[PDB]
Write an enzyme that holds these catalytic residues in place. Structure first.
Site, PDB file in Angstrom:
ATOM      1  N   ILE A   1       4.977  -4.158  10.328  1.00 52.60           N
ATOM      2  CA  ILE A   1       5.154  -3.914   8.919  1.00 52.60           C
ATOM      3  C   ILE A   1       4.826  -2.405   8.858  1.00 52.60           C
ATOM      4  O   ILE A   1       3.645  -2.044   8.879  1.00 52.60           O
ATOM      5  CB  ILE A   1       4.219  -4.770   8.086  1.00 52.60           C
ATOM      6  CG1 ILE A   1       4.735  -6.203   8.115  1.00 52.60           C
ATOM      7  CG2 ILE A   1       4.245  -4.296   6.568  1.00 52.60           C
ATOM      8  CD1 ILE A   1       3.703  -7.254   7.473  1.00 52.60           C
TER       9      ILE A   1
ATOM     10  N   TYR B   1      -3.581  -9.731   5.219  1.00 50.08           N
ATOM     11  CA  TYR B   1      -3.446  -8.337   5.568  1.00 50.08           C
ATOM     12  C   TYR B   1      -4.835  -7.730   5.710  1.00 50.08           C
ATOM     13  O   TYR B   1      -5.532  -7.608   4.733  1.00 50.08           O
ATOM     14  CB  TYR B   1      -2.566  -7.621   4.544  1.00 50.08           C
ATOM     15  CG  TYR B   1      -2.444  -6.128   4.643  1.00 50.08           C
ATOM     16  CD1 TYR B   1      -2.721  -5.418   5.813  1.00 50.08           C
ATOM     17  CD2 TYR B   1      -2.000  -5.421   3.519  1.00 50.08           C
ATOM     18  CE1 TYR B   1      -2.588  -4.049   5.841  1.00 50.08           C
ATOM     19  CE2 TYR B   1      -1.854  -4.074   3.566  1.00 50.08           C
ATOM     20  CZ  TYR B   1      -2.129  -3.413   4.670  1.00 50.08           C
ATOM     21  OH  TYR B   1      -1.914  -2.082   4.604  1.00 50.08           O
TER      22      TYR B   1
ATOM     23  N   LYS C   1      -0.944  -9.454   8.784  1.00 49.55           N
ATOM     24  CA  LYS C   1      -0.652  -8.055   9.166  1.00 49.55           C
ATOM     25  C   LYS C   1      -2.004  -7.518   9.616  1.00 49.55           C
ATOM     26  O   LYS C   1      -2.946  -7.386   8.813  1.00 49.55           O
ATOM     27  CB  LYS C   1      -0.159  -7.295   7.907  1.00 49.55           C
ATOM     28  CG  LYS C   1       0.051  -5.744   8.167  1.00 49.55           C
ATOM     29  CD  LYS C   1       0.632  -5.047   6.893  1.00 49.55           C
ATOM     30  CE  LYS C   1       0.648  -3.554   7.145  1.00 49.55           C
ATOM     31  NZ  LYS C   1       0.861  -2.833   5.849  1.00 49.55           N
TER      32      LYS C   1
ATOM     33  N   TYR D   1     -13.172  -3.172  -1.742  1.00 50.88           N
ATOM     34  CA  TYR D   1     -14.252  -2.614  -2.563  1.00 50.88           C
ATOM     35  C   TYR D   1     -15.401  -3.588  -2.827  1.00 50.88           C
ATOM     36  O   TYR D   1     -16.538  -3.193  -2.662  1.00 50.88           O
ATOM     37  CB  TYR D   1     -13.698  -2.032  -3.878  1.00 50.88           C
ATOM     38  CG  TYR D   1     -14.851  -1.416  -4.690  1.00 50.88           C
ATOM     39  CD1 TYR D   1     -15.531  -0.254  -4.211  1.00 50.88           C
ATOM     40  CD2 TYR D   1     -15.230  -1.970  -5.908  1.00 50.88           C
ATOM     41  CE1 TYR D   1     -16.622   0.268  -4.916  1.00 50.88           C
ATOM     42  CE2 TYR D   1     -16.288  -1.419  -6.645  1.00 50.88           C
ATOM     43  CZ  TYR D   1     -16.970  -0.282  -6.118  1.00 50.88           C
ATOM     44  OH  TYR D   1     -18.026   0.274  -6.786  1.00 50.88           O
TER      45      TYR D   1
ATOM     46  N   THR E   1       0.852  -1.179   0.000  1.00 54.11           N
ATOM     47  CA  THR E   1       0.000   0.000   0.000  1.00 54.11           C
ATOM     48  C   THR E   1       0.910   1.259   0.000  1.00 54.11           C
ATOM     49  O   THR E   1       0.683   2.267  -0.749  1.00 54.11           O
ATOM     50  CB  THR E   1      -0.791   0.078   1.313  1.00 54.11           C
ATOM     51  OG1 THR E   1      -1.400  -1.187   1.554  1.00 54.11           O
ATOM     52  CG2 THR E   1      -1.902   1.116   1.175  1.00 54.11           C
TER      53      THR E   1
ATOM     54  N   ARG F   1      -9.624   0.837   4.881  1.00 57.66           N
ATOM     55  CA  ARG F   1      -9.365   1.016   3.433  1.00 57.66           C
ATOM     56  C   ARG F   1     -10.211   0.108   2.556  1.00 57.66           C
ATOM     57  O   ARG F   1     -10.487   0.443   1.389  1.00 57.66           O
ATOM     58  CB  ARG F   1      -7.909   0.642   3.103  1.00 57.66           C
ATOM     59  CG  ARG F   1      -6.917   1.686   3.663  1.00 57.66           C
ATOM     60  CD  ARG F   1      -5.482   1.322   3.286  1.00 57.66           C
ATOM     61  NE  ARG F   1      -4.492   2.333   3.694  1.00 57.66           N
ATOM     62  CZ  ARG F   1      -4.062   3.337   2.906  1.00 57.66           C
ATOM     63  NH1 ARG F   1      -4.642   3.570   1.724  1.00 57.66           N
ATOM     64  NH2 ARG F   1      -3.109   4.167   3.344  1.00 57.66           N
TER      65      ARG F   1
HETATM   66 CL   LIG Z   1       2.185  -3.085   3.074  1.00 61.10          CL
HETATM   67 MG   LIG Z   2      -9.279  -5.494   5.311  1.00 60.32          MG
END
Ligand SMILES: [Cl-]
Ligand SMILES: [Mg+2]
Ligand SMILES: [Cl-]
Lengths: 291, 291
Positions: free
Chosen positions: B203, B133, B161, B107, B44, B138
């Protein structure tokens, strides 16, 4: 210009996931016969996320072909990369789409100025009417009414699909715009009220399974007939709830399979509607008179 | 197995957005010299969203080439399509990546079972260590601790993560896993806390600008030295806050620019850090002794 009931059409798929071209052609024909005013090809409900670029082009191409100029076709061309949104939007222009629908960039969370620059870059790159689309619960970003009002000043930006379902906020947006661009509901539960308040139409999930009903709700609401909009919407109100029991388009695709109109294909990470929800969904369709 | 300070490295870019290869090489070198324990390529913070497929491969290949096996390199390979994730993950394996980092589909909001099938399908398609993750703000979806625990049973699923920043929930996840896979913090502000509770590392965004200090914070926190973890994290605690005053990686790229290490390039829909935040950023960097 584009008004009334605009179906966010599913992309019918065979069991292995391949696009089911025969069923699609039949669904577009049925929408036209039942009163749907426009079709959004390959938006969220049409699984834009898991169709390849060639599959986007082909689905848009086929829907335009079958429609044969009878209703406008809007292509979903959103991306979270400005460069990619441009390429998608150009391709839709070249296919002969009437407009493009562009969700705000999702996942990467641009600033409001970044949203402004993203849409202005696309508007300046492709001469095609563009419809903004805000759905903060899916994207991680909320395109504020202030930023929408700014973007309405950009040539080629011609509307916004407001999926907030926040009716005071959508009224405030319509009033601020004063006609400068269109507002479409992206929330079937409250669309009838937003249309009564001056929205130009409803870019609808429910219209996938009740196209004639939703076309009527939109006509009476656009005509400002509050009682008729309430009464007609009430008949399908339960459908607006049940079509989101799992994330759309999971339930709507199951509903269409129960109606005999499409097969069960849907692409990972999406999944056919969980077994426990299929009986309740059948009961809602039966109650609504659809099956 | 991978432990410590794992930098989520930016992808430096020229003013016109082209990848700045020389500056990326210098950064990879400086991380290794400074004590960084691993690098996530094209995550990201690396603008995965706006890099092309070829650029995702070139950046991965360059970080691997420069690191020359001195530290493990993890490739960001997430996608919101299971097919596309399998393709990106295969490519990362083929380029020699030590592991892959795969954000939940964003999304399109899959169900918990769809998230399970998504990652199961990738683990079975690609023999490479996978790190889940979860960053629900987001993506619009939250991979629950229960789903994470099921997934840890799947062979090549070797960690997660957790960017929720919710320490009691991350502790509950560590406790429920009992070692079955690793937990990494994805929230610099709380990372020291989560490592004291059993996370295998961080991370980290802040590691982009304080790689030595964050290497030392992770090492003492993994050692369970609560006093030294707190002391060391205090010196960089304001950086964890200021690097999110606009969406990451906007502030971090600006910081690396003020440090003389990269140029201002960043790809729409992201924008260069707004002027109003630049002086405070610069002061925070001066306060931390970074510039
Ligand atoms: Cl990342
Ligand atoms: Mg998520
Ligand atoms: Cl749509």
């Amino acid at each position: 210009t584009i008004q009334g009931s605009i179906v966010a059409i599913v992309t019918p798929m065979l069991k292995d996931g391949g696009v089911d071209w025969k069923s699609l052609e039949k669904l577009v024909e049925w929408h036209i016969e039942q009163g749907t005013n426009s079709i959004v090809a390959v938006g969220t409900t049409g699984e834009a996320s898991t169709l390849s670029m060639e599959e986007h082009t082909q689905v848009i191409k086929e829907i335009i072909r079958v429609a044969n100029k009878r209703i406008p076709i809007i292509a979903g061309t959103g991306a979270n990369s400005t460069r990619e949104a441009i390429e998608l939007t150009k391709a839709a222009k070249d296919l002969g789409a009437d407009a493009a629908l562009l969700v705000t960039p999702y996942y990467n969370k641009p600033t409001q100025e970044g949203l402004y620059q993203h849409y202005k870059a696309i508007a300046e790159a492709v001469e095609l009417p563009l419809i903004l689309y805000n759905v903060p619960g899916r994207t991680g970003v909320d395109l504020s009414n202030d930023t929408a009002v700014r973007l309405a000043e950009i040539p080629n930006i011609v509307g916004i699909k407001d999926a907030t379902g926040d009716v005071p906020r959508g009224k405030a947006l319509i009033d601020a715009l004063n006609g400068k661009m269109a507002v479409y509901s992206g929330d079937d539960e409250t669309a009838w009220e937003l249309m009564l308040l001056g929205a130009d139409g409803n870019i609808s999930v429910t219209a996938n399974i009740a196209p004639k009903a939703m076309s009527e709700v939109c006509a009476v609401a656009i005509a400002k007939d509050e009682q008729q909009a309430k009464t007609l919407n009430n008949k399908i109100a339960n459908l607006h709830n049940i079509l989101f029991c799992e994330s759309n388009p999971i339930p709507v695709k199951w509903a269409l399979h129960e109606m005999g109109l499409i097969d069960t294909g849907i692409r990972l990470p999406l999944t056919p509607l969980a077994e426990q929800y299929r009986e309740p969904l059948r009961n809602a369709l039966k109650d609504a008179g659809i099956i």
